Design a protein around this ligand. Sequence first.
Ligand SMILES: CCCCCC
Ligand SMILES: CCCCCC
Ligand SMILES: CCCCCC
Ligand SMILES: CCCCCC
Ligand SMILES: [Cs+]
Ligand SMILES: [Cs+]
Ligand SMILES: [Cs+]
Ligand SMILES: [Cs+]
Ligand SMILES: [Cs+]
Ligand SMILES: [Cs+]
Ligand code: NA
Lengths: 93, 93, 93, 93
Amino acid sequence: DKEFQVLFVLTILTLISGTIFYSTVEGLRPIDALYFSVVTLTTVGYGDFSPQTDFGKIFTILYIFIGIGLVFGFIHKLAVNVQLPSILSNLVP
Amino acid sequence: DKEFQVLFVLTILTLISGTIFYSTVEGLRPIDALYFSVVTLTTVGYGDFSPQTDFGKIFTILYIFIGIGLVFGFIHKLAVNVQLPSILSNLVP
Amino acid sequence: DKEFQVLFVLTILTLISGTIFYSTVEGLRPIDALYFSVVTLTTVGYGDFSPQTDFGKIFTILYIFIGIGLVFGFIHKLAVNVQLPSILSNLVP
Amino acid sequence: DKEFQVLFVLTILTLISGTIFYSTVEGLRPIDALYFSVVTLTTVGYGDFSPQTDFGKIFTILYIFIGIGLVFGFIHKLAVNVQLPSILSNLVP
Ligand SMILES: CCCCCC
Ligand SMILES: CCCCCC
Ligand SMILES: CCCCCC
Ligand SMILES: CCCCCC
Ligand SMILES: [Cs+]
Ligand SMILES: [Cs+]
Ligand SMILES: [Cs+]
Ligand SMILES: [Cs+]
Ligand SMILES: [Cs+]
Ligand SMILES: [Cs+]
Ligand code: NA
């Protein structure tokens, strides 16, 4: 709960940074920048968007290393402290 | 066993939702929608399919965050409670 | 050691199955089929190769679910029982 | 701390090897080779770059198996021994 709120905020800030960076330097629409940031940090990485500038490539290297750990921490916990109980609630007779 | 059955069903429902969504909004054939949903939530993300609409991009953001944890829970357990014993069975003299 | 040998063999068999399947049904050269099988099961998923047939898509769904757990088990252990000691050996004075 | 320094160096060496290999054999600019090496070993795998030669494909198979474990060890620890405390520091009243 308490830890869920922090990983939420931390994830949001990371995604906001990506949205701002890729819309500015890589010229993406904000929605596309957000979508790309999420697809990147979850490692889905479709490649429909990818950085074309050297600035964008270098940022992306750093963004991945800093952001993957945070994002998957949030995912794992969104799963552990928020969805694991809810599914159990729709279990017990 | 019991926990395997629940993660199976949960995964199936998630994949059904993706199949329905991407066949409707993104215009994929159902088999392609299913295939895309699986490739997305396992993070393989080939990019042969990817959402082209803003609706599809937003759903995909949410779908990834909600679904990755469930899918990899199932994978890890399909591995832990179903394939780890079976391989050991074809071991002991 | 003992467990390393089993995860090695298991991984090899999985990769052989993929190599055979994708070279036959998807028409890839064997080296390309092997490379694609590895890129798939490690979730790198560049998308330079991807299944074009419905048979290939369905197999790929199943291949991912069955194979990711095994492959990452091997990777994690190749890391835990084979490279973690070796790096420590080149540490202690 | 001590363990953070080792996983840092190990990661750097792995990324240097990839940078050298893909710039030489696959003809990438060094910055692109580095970027590609990172995108590969974190499994983001956009596919804007991918090996076109058989030498490059075989190396990439081996590079992934050897490098993913190391890279994600570093990521998880960059998260555990360097960012987990820092976020807690900006917490306690
Ligand atoms: C499918 C190619 C996308 C290119 C992104 C810049
Ligand atoms: C390889 C490009 C695929 C585009 C998907 C809409
Ligand atoms: C980059 C497109 C590859 C298509 C694979 C069939
Ligand atoms: C989007 C296609 C990239 C091809 C890399 C060699
Ligand atoms: Cs990917
Ligand atoms: Cs991709
Ligand atoms: Cs793509
Ligand atoms: Cs693609
Ligand atoms: Cs591609
Ligand atoms: Cs691509
Ligand atoms: Na991935």
